[PDB]
Design a protein that fits this description.
mainly beta; Endonuclease - Pi-scei, Chain A, domain 1; 6-stranded antiparallel sheet; 1 helix; Endonuclease PI-MtuI; hydrolase; monomeric
Length: 139
C-alpha cells in the first residue's frame, strides 16, 4: 500500500494528485504506468482502495524524492520487482525523468524508519503500476 501524501503525476492532464484525495474522492485520473519492456504509458485508474492506517517505510532516492509505502509494497528495481522492505541504500529503483518523461534508474540514498499513516492502492487498468513521487511501483 502507498502512504497518504504520495504524489501521483497524471500524464494526460499534467496534474499531480495526492493519493488520499484521489481515493477519498474517487477521481478517475490517469497515471504513468510501466509495461514489461521498459516502456511507460498512460493508463486510467478504475478502482480506489482505502487501506486504513499502517506502517510505511521511506525510500529516499537520488534527487531528493522519497516514496512512502508499506514494506510489502512492490517497487521496480534494477533487479526486477521487489518488496519495499527488502530494499537498502545502494539499490537502484526505476524512476520517471521529470523532464524527458523517460524511464531511468536512481540510487536509494537512505531507508527511513516506519511511520504511521493512512494507506491506499488503486487499480490501474491493464498495467497495474504507476509512478509515485517519481518512482515506478505496483498500483
Amino acid at each position: 500500500c502507498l502512504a497518504e501524501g504520495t504524489r501521483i503525476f497524471d500524464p494526460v492532464t499534467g496534474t499531480t494528485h495526492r493519493i488520499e484525495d484521489v481515493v477519498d474522492g474517487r477521481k478517475p485520473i490517469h497515471v504513468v504506468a510501466a509495461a514489461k519492456d521498459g516502456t511507460l504509458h498512460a493508463r486510467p485508474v478504475v478502482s480506489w482502495f482505502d487501506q486504513g492506517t499502517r506502517d510505511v517505510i521511506g525510500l529516499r532516492i537520488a534527487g531528493g524524492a522519497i516514496v512512502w509505502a508499506t514494506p510489502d509494497h512492490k517497487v521496480l528495481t534494477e533487479y526486477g520487482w521487489r518488496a519495499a522492505g527488502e530494499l537498502r541504500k545502494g539499490d537502484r529503483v526505476a524512476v520517471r525523468d521529470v523532464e524527458t518523461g523517460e524511464l531511468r534508474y536512481s540510487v536509494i540514498r537512505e531507508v527511513l524508519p516506519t511511520r504511521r499513516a493512512r494507506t491506499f492502492d488503486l487499480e490501474v487498468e491493464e498495467l497495474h503500476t504507476l509512478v509515485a513521487e517519481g518512482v515506478v511501483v505496483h498500483n
